[PDB]
Amino acid sequence: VNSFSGYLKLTDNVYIKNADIVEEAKKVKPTVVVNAANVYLKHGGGVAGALNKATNNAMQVESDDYIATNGPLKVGGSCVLSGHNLAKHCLHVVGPNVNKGEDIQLLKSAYENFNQHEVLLAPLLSAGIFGADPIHSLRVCVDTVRTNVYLAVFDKNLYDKLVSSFLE
Numbered sequence: 001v002n003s004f005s006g007y008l009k010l011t012d013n014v015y016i017k018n019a020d021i022v023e024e025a026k027k028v029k030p031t032v033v034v035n036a037a038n039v040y041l042k043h044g045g046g047v048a049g050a051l052n053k054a055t056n057n058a059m060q061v062e063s064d065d066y067i068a069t070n071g072p073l074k075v076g077g078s079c080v081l082s083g084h085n086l087a088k089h090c091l092h093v094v095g096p097n098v099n100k101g102e103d104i105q106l107l108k109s110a111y112e113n114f115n116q117h118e119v120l121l122a123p124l125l126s127a128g129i130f131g132a133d134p135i136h137s138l139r140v141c142v143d144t145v146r147t148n149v150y151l152a153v154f155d156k157n158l159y160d161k162l163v164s165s166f167l168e
């Protein structure tokens, strides 16, 4: 049903809210929820661990069967699988992990995957323990994504800093 509410409108197609992406998926019932994935789809930590636990491990079981036959994703790449009880589909997107020396330039490629979907509920790619500058990830999102993206950022201090810096 894609019933998003309580978002700040940053541009004509990018919205942001201080919220847990899991609670937003349960309220909104989106067509697509984006996972902040890694190349072997190991759903531990951050967004991935929270989405997988909210599916009672159904996401991990499906992802392990996908990887057994198809192998790992590339950094900047994505994979549509089931959204289970959270969404119709889950778009698993791998942003670069700059704390592990991956190329920050691939963050644009990671957000370009969003353009295949009319509307998405998504996290801020490559933030948290992946190490990218959040203000930079928000600018790449705004400059790259043309479809409707609703960003859920589960940290009030980070949310306030992003909004204040975007509005300068």
Ligand SMILES: CC(C)[C@H](Nc1ncnc2[nH]c(-c3cnn(CC(=O)N(C)C)c3)cc12)c1ccc2c(c1)OCCO2
Pocket: 019, 020, 021, 022, 036, 037, 045, 046, 047, 050, 123, 124, 125, 126, 127, 128, 129, 130, 152, 153, 154, 155, 158
């Ligand atoms: C930057 C941060 C704030 C962001 N995290 C998040 N952004 C949006 N919704 C989120 N939910 C959770 C979460 C975790 N646990 N729970 C359950 C819970 O707290 N319960 C009490 C039941 C919910 C984290 C989260 C982020 C974004 C991208 C990343 C990244 C992290 O980790 C590495 C890859 O990429």
